[PDB]
Structure formats: structure tokens, C-alpha cells
Design an enzyme around this catalytic site. Structure first.
Site, PDB file in Angstrom:
ATOM      1  CG  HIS A   1      45.734 -12.419 -11.426  1.00  0.00           C
ATOM      2  ND1 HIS A   1      46.123 -12.873 -12.616  1.00  0.00           N
ATOM      3  CD2 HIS A   1      46.856 -12.534 -10.573  1.00  0.00           C
ATOM      4  CE1 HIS A   1      47.427 -13.276 -12.577  1.00  0.00           C
ATOM      5  NE2 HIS A   1      47.879 -13.066 -11.319  1.00  0.00           N
TER       6      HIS A   1
ATOM      7  CG  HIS B   1      51.090  -9.509 -11.314  1.00  0.00           C
ATOM      8  ND1 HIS B   1      52.208 -10.001 -10.785  1.00  0.00           N
ATOM      9  CD2 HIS B   1      50.111 -10.521 -11.186  1.00  0.00           C
ATOM     10  CE1 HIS B   1      52.003 -11.266 -10.313  1.00  0.00           C
ATOM     11  NE2 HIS B   1      50.704 -11.587 -10.566  1.00  0.00           N
TER      12      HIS B   1
ATOM     13  CG  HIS C   1      50.557 -11.997 -18.797  1.00  0.00           C
ATOM     14  ND1 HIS C   1      51.715 -12.205 -19.517  1.00  0.00           N
ATOM     15  CD2 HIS C   1      50.943 -11.902 -17.500  1.00  0.00           C
ATOM     16  CE1 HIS C   1      52.743 -12.245 -18.645  1.00  0.00           C
ATOM     17  NE2 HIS C   1      52.326 -12.065 -17.405  1.00  0.00           N
TER      18      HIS C   1
ATOM     19  CD  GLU D   1      45.519 -15.927 -10.633  1.00  0.00           C
ATOM     20  OE1 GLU D   1      46.619 -16.027 -10.057  1.00  0.00           O
ATOM     21  OE2 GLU D   1      45.362 -16.162 -11.837  1.00  0.00           O
TER      22      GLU D   1
ATOM     23  CG  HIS E   1      49.255 -12.447  -7.249  1.00  0.00           C
ATOM     24  ND1 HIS E   1      49.092 -13.230  -8.320  1.00  0.00           N
ATOM     25  CD2 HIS E   1      48.353 -12.916  -6.278  1.00  0.00           C
ATOM     26  CE1 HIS E   1      48.139 -14.173  -8.080  1.00  0.00           C
ATOM     27  NE2 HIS E   1      47.685 -13.979  -6.820  1.00  0.00           N
TER      28      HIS E   1
ATOM     29  CB  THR F   1      48.613 -18.178 -10.921  1.00  0.00           C
ATOM     30  OG1 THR F   1      48.810 -16.773 -11.108  1.00  0.00           O
ATOM     31  CG2 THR F   1      48.575 -18.541  -9.412  1.00  0.00           C
ATOM     32  CB  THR F   2      51.137 -16.673 -15.589  1.00  0.00           C
ATOM     33  OG1 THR F   2      52.319 -16.220 -14.922  1.00  0.00           O
ATOM     34  CG2 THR F   2      49.968 -15.785 -15.218  1.00  0.00           C
TER      35      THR F   2
HETATM   36 ZN   LIG Z   1      49.652 -13.180 -10.258  1.00  0.00          ZN
END
Ligand SMILES: [Zn+2]
Length: 258
Positions: free
Chosen positions: A94, A92, A62, A104, A117, A196-197
Site C-alpha cells: 500500500h 503486497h 488495487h 495503513e 503486508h 483492509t480491503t
Molecule cells: Zn494489505
């Protein structure tokens, strides 16, 4: 089936397996700069990453995570709206399929090309697993990425992506210094939120930096070459792995600056 960012397993489907997705303190949110309250009580952030020990880079299906040795107080975060010491465990990203989307969090509805993040867990809890079960268990430092000039400090990460193209792959990634990903200013916004996941646990104190860092188009282009799939499966490019803004509800966003 398994959650993802596709039409059939994307964000709007998550609530079915993780009902907390419709909770009271979900992230990300849109930062309305005009209603965010400047709070003079907020202390400056303290980031001590000089002793940081990176160990590995991994494609989890992801996103890609760079993991750090969190067995001791080597790379910690404190100050700001935090009480206590939070240890860095991993960072990580996004990102989007195009430069106009990918972040995000949004600022006055503005979306950035990507969002970094930096995840930290409260030492008072012993380990990451226990920490995620507490309202003040994690501290996530969010940094916006805009396309422009190259970020020299990001190149080492970009260079290794080839070796972890598909889900499940990992590679040794030692001696990486996270200080090269930080903007010049440490001004920030903060509000209580969530991961957020999935599992979308509401254990996060979000610290979102006002100042974005610049990366080149060539750099972000390499993020877009990663795969959601595992080796030997139909190729599905890892792009748009971001969750849309959630309602703020009964929350107030505070700013550390006027
Ligand atoms: Zn994140």
C-alpha cells in the site's frame, strides 16, 4: 460501482456493499505507543522463510501481489501471539502519491511512505478460503517503509513492475526470497483486526513490526507508475491505495517490547 480508492468508490463508500466496514475489529488502526501494553507473555516471532517458493507477480487492480506455493509448510510463521502454523500465501503493498503518506497503520499518528503486508493462513483450516471465515484464520505481518537508502532485496520486485503495469496482468516470478524485506529487529505490536480491503473480514491477527525498512525514492517511484486500470482504458495511476485508520473500540494493542 466496483470498490476502489477514488472519490466515488473509496473507503468511505465501502460500508454500502460491505457493512462489516463499520464493525468492531476493523483495520488499520493508529498505534498509540504510550497506551500499548507491554506483554511479557508474548513469545518471539518465528519466521521460517528459507524454503519459500514464489510463483507469480500479479496486478489485481488495487495493488500488486507476489504469490507463493502454499501447498506445503514451506514458508511459515509461528510464535509471537500465534497458536499453530500459518502459511505464507502472498505479500503486497500500500503506498502514497507523496512520501508523507501511504501506510495503513500509523504510529502516534505518523504515516509512512508505504506498508508491506505478508499474508499467512492458519493450517488447521485446510485452505485460505476456509481460514478467512475464522477469527484466528489469518496472520498478517505488517512492515513500514520509509524513504532513505535503497533496499537491495526489493530491486527484483521493482524491476518486474513494467511487465504488469495494468490490471489483470501477471508474470512468472520464481526464486524470490522474502527474507530480504525483513528489518533487523523482530519487535512488534499485535492486536485482533481485519482485512483492509473488501470483504474486510475480521479474521486477522495483526503483527506490526516496530522497525521500518528503508527504500530509495527511485524505488517507491516505480510503484507509482502502476495503473489501477486495465490495458486500453483511461490511465489512472495506482497511488494512495491505503485505507485510513479505524477506531480501536474495545481492543488493546500489546507490545512485545518495553
Ligand atoms: Zn494489505
Amino acid at each position: 460501482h466496483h470498490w476502489g480508492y477514488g472519490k466515488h468508490n473509496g473507503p468511505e463508500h465501502w460500508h454500502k456493499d460491505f457493512p462489516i466496514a463499520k464493525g468492531e475489529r476493523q483495520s488499520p488502526v493508529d498505534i498509540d505507543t504510550h497506551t500499548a501494553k507491554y506483554d511479557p507473555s508474548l513469545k518471539p516471532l518465528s519466521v521460517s522463510y528459507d524454503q519459500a517458493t514464489s510463483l507469480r507477480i500479479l496486478n489485481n487492480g488495487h495493488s500488486f501481489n507476489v504469490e507463493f506455493d502454499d501447498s506445503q509448510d514451506k514458508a511459515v510463521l509461528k510464535g509471537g501471539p500465534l497458536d499453530g502454523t500459518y502459511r505464507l500465501i502472498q505479500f503486497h503493498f500500500h503506498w502514497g502519491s507523496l512520501d508523507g503518506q501511504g501506510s495503513e497503520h500509523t504510529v502516534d499518528k505518523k504515516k509512512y511512505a508505504a506498508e508491506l503486508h505478508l499474508v499467512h493462513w492458519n493450517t488447521k483450516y485446510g485452505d485460505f478460503g476456509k481460514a478467512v471465515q475464522q477469527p484466528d484464520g489469518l496472520a498478517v505481518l505488517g512492515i513500514f517503509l520509509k524513504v532513505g537508502s535503497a533496499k537491495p532485496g526489493l530491486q527484483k520486485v521493482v524491476d518486474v513492475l513494467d511487465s504488469i503495469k495494468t490490471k489483470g496482468k501477471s508474470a512468472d516470478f520464481t526464486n524470490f526470497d522474502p527474507r530480504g524485506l525483513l528489518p533487523e529487529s523482530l519487535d512488534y505490536w499485535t492486536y485482533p483486526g481485519s482485512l483492509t480491503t473488501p470483504p474486510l473480514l475480521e479474521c486477522v491477527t495483526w503483527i506490526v513490526l516496530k522497525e521500518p525498512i528503508s527504500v530509495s525514492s527511485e524505488q517507491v517511484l516505480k510503484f507509482r507508475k502502476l495503473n489501477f486500470n486495465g490495458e486500453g482504458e483511461p490511465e489512472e495511476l495506482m497511488v494512495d491505495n491505503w485505507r485510513p485508520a479505524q477506531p480501536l473500540k474495545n481492543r488493546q494493542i500489546k507490545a512485545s517490547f518495553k
